[PDB]
Amino acid sequence: PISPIETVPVKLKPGMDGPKVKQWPLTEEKIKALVEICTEMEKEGKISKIGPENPYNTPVFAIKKKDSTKWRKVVDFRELNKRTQDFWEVQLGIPHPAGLKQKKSVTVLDVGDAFYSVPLDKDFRKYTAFTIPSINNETPGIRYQYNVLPMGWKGSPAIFQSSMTKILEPFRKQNPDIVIYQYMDDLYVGSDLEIGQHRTKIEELRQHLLRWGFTTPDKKHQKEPPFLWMGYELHPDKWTVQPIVLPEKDSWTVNDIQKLVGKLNWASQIYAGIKVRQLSKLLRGTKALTEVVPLTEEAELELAENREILKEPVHGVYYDPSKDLIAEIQKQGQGQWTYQIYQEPFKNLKTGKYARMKGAHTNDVKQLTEAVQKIATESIVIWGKTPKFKLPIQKETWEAWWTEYWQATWIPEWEFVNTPPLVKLWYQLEKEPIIGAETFYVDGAANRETKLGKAGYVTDRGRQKVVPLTDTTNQKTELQAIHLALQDSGLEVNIVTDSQYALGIIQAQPDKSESELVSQIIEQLIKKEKVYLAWVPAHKGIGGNEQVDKLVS
């Protein structure tokens, strides 16, 4: 049926008119499948026949459903969408099973032909005009328009959701002790009523829905566990994901690998320890989806590691508001991090991973802070509060970080957990110059129009060095000069540069970088025992800085 709900008024973007697009061909089974529903949608009043002074058209086709014996109908409204007003989408996120509490009675329902039961604004219907082909050379097609929300229009999902929200509103307020998760047309209904009274309330809900024109077919009315919901299986005490099947190929293409990385990301929400770094690395620099990419040795290992993790069965548990949330993180290497969230030991609510490189130059402490922030945000979304953290970083390490780092930074209440490899600062710049250490006045000069440069140093004990640089930048020669001073100095060194650029990078104590030059500098900072790094202004005749600049000419 069609809901007696008031329509949502809709507009075209100012200045624009409706779509005018001729039809294309389709098959045996996708013209009967449409005429079967088109003449049937018309008998139900979903569509009306129109004619030639409606100047608009939009092509039509169909697509299979997981029903499989049923067909879904879709209209290529791409151009009408471009000319339809903007909408503010009300679906703000995806519900997750780890956010559910244990319920003594659970039901999952779906609405049948849900879009086709919400009416469309009267004045907008003429823009939804289409033509049904009938094997194409047969006949000139019949013209219809939509009286309900069509599948494929930009406005239909949001107008449906809002319409569903208004309809459920009376039932929710009258029954606050009943949890209703509303995702599109799928209704999860859990309660603490014994099953007798629970089915009473369900039948009450279904009857309210039907008065407003929403059917709930038996086919989609799950009454018993396990419940299939949002891609998961809901058991009384635990939940699983539906089986994740990974591609296995002799020859991989870029697109195959893109598919594989996506499945593993989806798996990481409950499978601990999933990694995708080495497999995603193959996607870099590639220039075609059909391009065959050979797996590197590291990618095969990572792939095999992931396959061993997925071979073992796993489950999440449900949320107990009477206990705290606990987040624990582990370092995995090359900027990869995995975590588990739980309330009792060895019973995960969910897992996840963080593996983004933010910025050209960073360290493990920064990334650990970003992992904590991602987890903290996820926790607000699912449970409405942040968790207590268990971090593999010592208190002295963190304390040293936020005192010698100039940006404000913070981590919530956390407890140190000894799960090596630990997060540490890999070197620390000395706060004051080192007595006995040699002093290097470094400088690097490049010419912007040439591409050629020089880097070098002079020294209080007496060393000088100039190396020519080819195809370099101003900033590279400055890093190059610092690189040489670390190269030629002992375990303790004082360095004075005139590049705020280079000082800024190094003073942040990076332990990884996208630049091989900065990585070379980092490897040398770690090998040293004491390093002091000082800045002076260039071109002011300051002794030491002046003569090295005098030399790099």
Next chain:
Amino acid sequence: IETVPVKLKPGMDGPKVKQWPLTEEKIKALVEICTEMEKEGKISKIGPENPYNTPVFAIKKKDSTKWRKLVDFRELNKRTQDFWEVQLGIPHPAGLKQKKSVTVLDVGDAYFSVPLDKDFRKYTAFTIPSINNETPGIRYQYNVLPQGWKGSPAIFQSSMTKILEPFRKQNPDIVIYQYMDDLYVGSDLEIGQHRTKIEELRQHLLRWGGYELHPDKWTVQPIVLPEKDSWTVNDIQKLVGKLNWASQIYAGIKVRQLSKLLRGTKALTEVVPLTEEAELELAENREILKEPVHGVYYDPSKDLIAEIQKQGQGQWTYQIYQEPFKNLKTGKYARMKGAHTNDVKQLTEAVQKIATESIVIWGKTPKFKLPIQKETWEAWWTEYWQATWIPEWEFVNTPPLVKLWY
């Protein structure tokens, strides 16, 4: 009442800013607040055909343990027509910054008795979120002058002035300044005697519809150079580099007689004796930096900018300028909350106090350059906000080349 016609600026659309996640306690409070506002007609439930949105959240002081709804109309205010253009802005009194105490009052609720141009209401939409996304977002728009909208003080201006004039005449040496939803009221009396009349003011305000600030103790922190009788090559280098930076601000500062003691490729730890023609340079520039700078005047036609630097051990230095190196104010904020750890809470409190001083001094807030990663700030700042307004800000990473301010 008749609505005043309002427009967005030419060629601009309304705000389209996504809602961010909220804790359980803030969601419950917003739902409690808005359902009551819907009943009283101040807001109305809307759908998705309204293409606009502005983030909402809630703050609760332990100054008063009730939740206050806060809609971040920063984008909408940026795109709203000027009201000093149309003869309805509020002038700032230069007397407020000199009074013994200035108390701040939240008078935003008085706006809820004036209807907003129905053609403009659709730009005020916001969306309450859902824990675990159990439900789609719930959307509202205002029917009255919204709190946090810069147009509400302008449209309400003529009403508030008549609400206040009895108080203004019965107490002529008190100066009151309305900024956004706030009243900044100051005068020269005992703390008890200042609390006298602010509460007389509250009950006259209640008849129709937190901290005590003390402007005199807002010390300016100048640029200070170190003091000791023995100087190393590194000490002179850092000094020469600090004054070279200050030469872009102050006037007639020299480093010629300090630079060439460093002549040669000296070792950083070598103790260089000061010449007479160096101690001359240092003590001379030491005081060019004692009393502040000549020729820098506030321009109400330009934006105020604030820069903050973390200094460690709970201290934060700040400068407020409009053109670079022409500082109207430089200061240093301090904290002692008793937990002694949180950098983000400290900076959030530092921004509010700096922004409050700008309102007191100049009548508007500055745009902040915050020494923090965008994502670290956005993870935590709303947990410490206690103003009914929100200043503009951007995120910088400026490694401390000079630390002239400490």
Next chain:
DNA sequence: TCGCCCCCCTTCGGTGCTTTGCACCGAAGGGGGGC
């Protein structure tokens, strides 16, 4: 040959800097998943 939402990984192009490349950031390409 269709729609809306979240997530991750990579690429690209706009912006500001007392710059001449560089780092940051948002958007858009690809993939996963939901209905």
